[PDB]
Design a protein around this ligand. Structure first.
Ligand code: HEM
Ligand SMILES: C[C@@H]1C[C@@](C)(c2cc(CNC3(C(F)(F)F)CC3)c(F)cc2F)N=C(N)S1
Ligand SMILES: [Zn+2]
Ligand SMILES: [Zn+2]
Length: 451
């Protein structure tokens, strides 16, 4: 077949309008094919999902204790080691969610802590990012370790700080070079420099896991994902094929922790920024909150079905926010065909999710914050096919149900008790974000006055 034509997200918008939705690039040793628009993305992740659910090899993960039966979930290669952890994490989230609503309970209570932390900043401008990280991180810790940490807890702060630094290391030029040739890691001085912040994050997490293993009561049903993991580890003793082992427990937990902490928080950070840039939208949400919930009762997930406008605003925050523009890289495990063109096995796939969320042929005004993107004339919530912030296919975000819950409950609770605005005397904050593998809003302050 014909190979795709050939010559950051702004650079891909030029290449798309010069070579089409499926073009190619040659980044050093790696052959890369970029996918643009819903059609091209769907064709790879859904139609040929069986052949595009693999990850590109990351040899430097061996420093972090990555093995064949211990690859975590996020970077895990397509196969049994991934499928077992994928199916486990998805099912455990569901099981902890249903029954007694443990998920909803921990989030609701964490929201109240977030509202209280905001209240102590009242009558004074501040950056909401730090508090959002802690509140979002605690929800994860409630699912993994079955606990939360105080906002001034020393180890908690260090855990969050190391996690934020570990994200920057992922986007380092030193990475790709060492990732290409693994024998460079044999250098003792060089090996410690590669992922010093990430390995620090692991070490700090180990200390917390060890403590948790002490308090775990096997005689009772697992309170959290780690306890559920530990319970499987005992059953998998004497089985070298199982991905349930000590080396993988610290990696899977680190995956779930890091993933749903920098994403959900950044989204909420975008959310509050769009609420002070567009106060009219904020008022309509707060009005719908009063008409459906009130101003004293805590928001519930059962309220979402009766709050179409708020649902549209949150969805539009994700769409406009566009926090993961280029998604997470895939890799072809076979030879496939995308939009007529041929894609060789082992080709690194890039899913330009930004081109889907900002598709001008789909959305009425893609480059604007327009809540009506998810509303019809009547006021009903509609969700277009092109809403893919969690990507699609087998590798689609397993944290989406939790994210949906965290976003609705945190966003509604904050607007229920606070009115957000720009601090007078300060410039109107740009709605353009600082580009990375994860797009955060441009640094801003806000005033949160109670109601
Ligand atoms: C606003 C919040 C979030 C967004 C926008 C988001 C987005 C994404 C994206 C784009 C991917 C890549 C999908 C692909 O490779 O095709 C992904 C994967 C993943 N996410 Fe999220 N995510 C969010 C929250 C979460 C949460 C809350 C968790 C866990 C509790 C989580 C855990 C994961 C994991 C483990 C993967 C890898 C799944 C796999 O490789 O099969 N994320 N997410
Ligand atoms: C969801 C995560 C996204 C980032 C960017 C990522 C990775 C780490 C470090 N990950 C570990 C390990 F799992 F590999 F062991 C050192 C503790 C972060 F601390 C933060 C991140 F965003 N990279 C990943 N490979 S998974
Ligand atoms: Zn526990
Ligand atoms: Zn309708």
């Amino acid at each position: 077949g014909k190979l795709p034509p050939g010559p950051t997200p702004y650079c891909f918008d030029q290449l798309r309008r010069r070579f089409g939705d499926v073009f190619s690039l040659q980044l050093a040793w790696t052959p890369v094919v970029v996918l643009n628009g819903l059609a091209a993305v769907r064709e790879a992740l859904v139609t040929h999902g069986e052949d595009t659910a693999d990850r590109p090899p990351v040899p430097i993960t061996q420093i972090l204790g990555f093995g064949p039966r211990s690859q975590g979930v996020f970077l895990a290669r397509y196969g049994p080691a991934w499928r077992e952890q994928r199916r486990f994490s998805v099912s455990t989230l569901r099981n902890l969610g249903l029954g007694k609503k443990s998920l909803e309970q921990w989030v609701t209570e964490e929201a109240a802590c977030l509202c209280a932390a905001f209240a102590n900043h009242s009558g004074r401008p501040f950056r909401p990012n730090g508090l959002l990280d802690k509140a979002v991180s605690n929800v994860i810790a409630s699912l993994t370790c079955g606990r939360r940490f105080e906002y001034d807890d020393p180890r908690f702060l260090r855990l969050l700080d190391l996690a934020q630094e570990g994200l920057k290391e992922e986007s380092g030029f030193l990475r790709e070079v060492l990732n290409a040739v693994p024998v460079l890691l044999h250098i003792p001085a060089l090996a410690g420099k590669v992922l010093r912040f990430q390995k620090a994050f692991l070490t700090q997490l180990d200390e917390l896991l060890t403590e948790h293993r002490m308090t775990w009561d096997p005689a009772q049903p697992p309170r959290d994902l780690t306890e559920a993991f530990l319970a499987e580890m005992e059953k998998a003793k004497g089985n070298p094929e199982s991905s349930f082992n000590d080396e993988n427990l610290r990696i899977v937990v680190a995956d779930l922790f890091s993933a749903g902490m920098v994403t959900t928080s950044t989204t909420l950070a975008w959310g509050l920024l769009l609420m002070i840039l567009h106060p009219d939208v904020q008022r309509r949400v707060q009005q719908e909150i009063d008409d459906v919930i009130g101003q004293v009762r805590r928001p519930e997930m059962g309220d979402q079905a009766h709050m179409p406008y708020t649902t549209a605003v949150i969805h539009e925050v994700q769409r406009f926010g566009d926090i993961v523009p280029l998604g997470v890289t895939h890799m072809t495990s076979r030879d496939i065909e995308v939009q007529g063109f041929r894609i060789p096995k082992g080709t690194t796939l890039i899913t330009n999710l930004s081109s889907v969320l900002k598709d001008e042929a789909v959305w009425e005004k893609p480059f604007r914050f327009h809540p009506e993107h998810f509303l019809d004339a009547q006021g009903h919530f509609v969700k277009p096919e092109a809403f893919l912030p969690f990507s699609a296919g087998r590798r689609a975000c397993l944290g989406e149900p939790l994210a949906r819950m965290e976003l609705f409950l945190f966003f509604t609770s904050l607007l229920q008790h606070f009115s957000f605005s720009v601090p007078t005397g300060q410039p109107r904050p740009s709605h353009h974000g600082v580009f990375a593998f994860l797009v955060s809003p441009s640094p801003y302050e806000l005033c949160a006055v109670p109601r």
